[PDB]
Amino acid sequence: SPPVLDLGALGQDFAADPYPTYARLRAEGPAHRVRTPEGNEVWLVVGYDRARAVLADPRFSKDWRNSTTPLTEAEAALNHNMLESDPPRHTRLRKLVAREFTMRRVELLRPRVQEIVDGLVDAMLAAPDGRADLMESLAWPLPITVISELLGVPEPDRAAFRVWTDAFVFPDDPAQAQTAMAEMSGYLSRLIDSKRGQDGEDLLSALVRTSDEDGSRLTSEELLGMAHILLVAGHETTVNLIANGMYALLSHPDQLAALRADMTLLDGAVEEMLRYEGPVESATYRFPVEPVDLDGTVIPAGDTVLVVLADAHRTPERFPDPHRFDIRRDTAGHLAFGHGIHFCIGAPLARLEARIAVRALLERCPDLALDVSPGELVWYPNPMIRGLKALPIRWR
Ligand code: HEM
């Protein structure tokens, strides 16, 4: 029952570089009870083959009615979304927006996305001494603008979102996380209400109309659950991809020039950014419905389980030379977007924003470099999301 390892005792060492610790675990076995820096005791499933199994395994439920851990009031407010569901609710819910996030549909957004990215890079090259934080001026503002537009979040109300979403990455403390969720959940509900009767053409309006017309298709809870899900999962992961990506790029200068000289490598590069430093370090909560034997180790019904995608991707048997960042490696079968029914619905939009951004910095900042001695970067210690506090850069 008790943890064999406390991760928060491992300090910034672990946050900077968690891989050898996961790697240490994988040697020993596939699953390990641990305590997270914020002190919840969870299970970690490690290693590609087993990691992949667990993601698609329906013995593992994403529905909290199956978790022995009780939800707080703020959280219960928001747990009615597809990602925290099993069939059929999951089915009814995903189907409501699937059309929306296909590759083809998204391609009709390339122009606007491009327009946004031009705006921010232009602004960014105007930093007097050729220095600034990539996170602050590109990686955060791009995804939030794009997704806000898709969903009808008015510009004045966007700033608050960096603040709130931060508050449930690493919270300073569990009290600040909770406040965020209520503050946000509160704001989303006004926003949803403000849509009623306004003939918006954005997806939130559309959902409100869908919901109001027939509350058996979408309940008022699920409506809020969706707005949230599509927003957070829209902001946070994309932001960190871009920021993890550029960083992998900037810290291996050979791979940078390679893509700089040949922009056919862009998609590959973005795939290796997801393979190598993907923003989803551990997939979201999983609750075995009955006890599950993973090679001798018996995880009990209703425990919290995390699949460590970060470790999946550093498994040498599935990825030769797992520590080398190689923009041309075969990246197929990576788990960065998950695997199975819950497979990420907005991968195409993610790839799109990232591709455009990575190209824009490379074609518009010659001589771009890390501004900062790499070991002076600071990583959030949360074991779910892989993320930088800041990412200073420079140019000629
Ligand atoms: C690089 C960016 C992204 C990464 C790495 C990523 C990764 C993931 C992963 C791993 C899952 C499944 C998690 C699990 O099984 O617990 C997932 C699901 C999901 N993602 Fe993303 N995602 C990204 C971008 C986005 C964006 C931009 C959106 C905005 C629409 C989005 C919306 C969702 C939703 C709604 C689900 C739940 C799908 C379902 O339960 O059927 N994601 N994503």
Side-chain angles (χ1 to χ4, degrees), residues 257-269:
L259 175 50
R260 256 220 219 255
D262 176 12
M263 282 292 332
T264 61
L265 307 161
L266 186 57
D267 298 356

Side-chain angles (χ1 to χ4, degrees), residues 7 10-24 247 276 281 308 310-311 314 322-323 374-375 377-383 386-387:
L7 295 165
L10 306 180
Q12 167 67 7
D13 275 7
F14 174 71
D17 179 18
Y19 302 113
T21 301
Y22 295 136
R24 221 182 74 240
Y247 172 62
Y276 178 82
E281 189 170 317
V308 186
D311 188 83
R314 300 304 172 112
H323 304 293
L377 289 168
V378 200
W379 298 80
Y380 288 120
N382 200 323
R386 189 137 166 86

Side-chain angles (χ1 to χ4, degrees), residues 62 82-83 90 94 233 237-238 284 286 336-338 342 344 350:
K62 304 214 72 269
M82 72 189 90
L83 185 52
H90 176 248
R94 196 183 165 102
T237 62
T238 314
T284 73
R286 278 172 171 74
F337 286 118
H342 288 286
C344 182

Side-chain angles (χ1 to χ4, degrees), residues 55 62 81-85 90 94 97 101 143 147 150 226 229-234 237-242 274 278-280 282-286 309 335-351 353-354:
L55 304 176
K62 304 214 72 269
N81 65 81
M82 72 189 90
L83 185 52
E84 311 196 278
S85 296
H90 176 248
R94 196 183 165 102
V97 278
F101 293 106
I147 199 51
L150 243 52
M226 186 83 67
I229 212 64
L230 295 174
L231 266 167
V232 187
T237 62
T238 314
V239 178
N240 283 301
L241 171 60
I242 295 172
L274 299 163
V280 181
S282 299
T284 73
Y285 284 27
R286 278 172 171 74
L309 311 200
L335 313 169
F337 286 118
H339 164 72
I341 55 183
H342 288 286
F343 178 103
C344 182
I345 220 203
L349 184 70
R351 296 176 148 117
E353 292 171 37

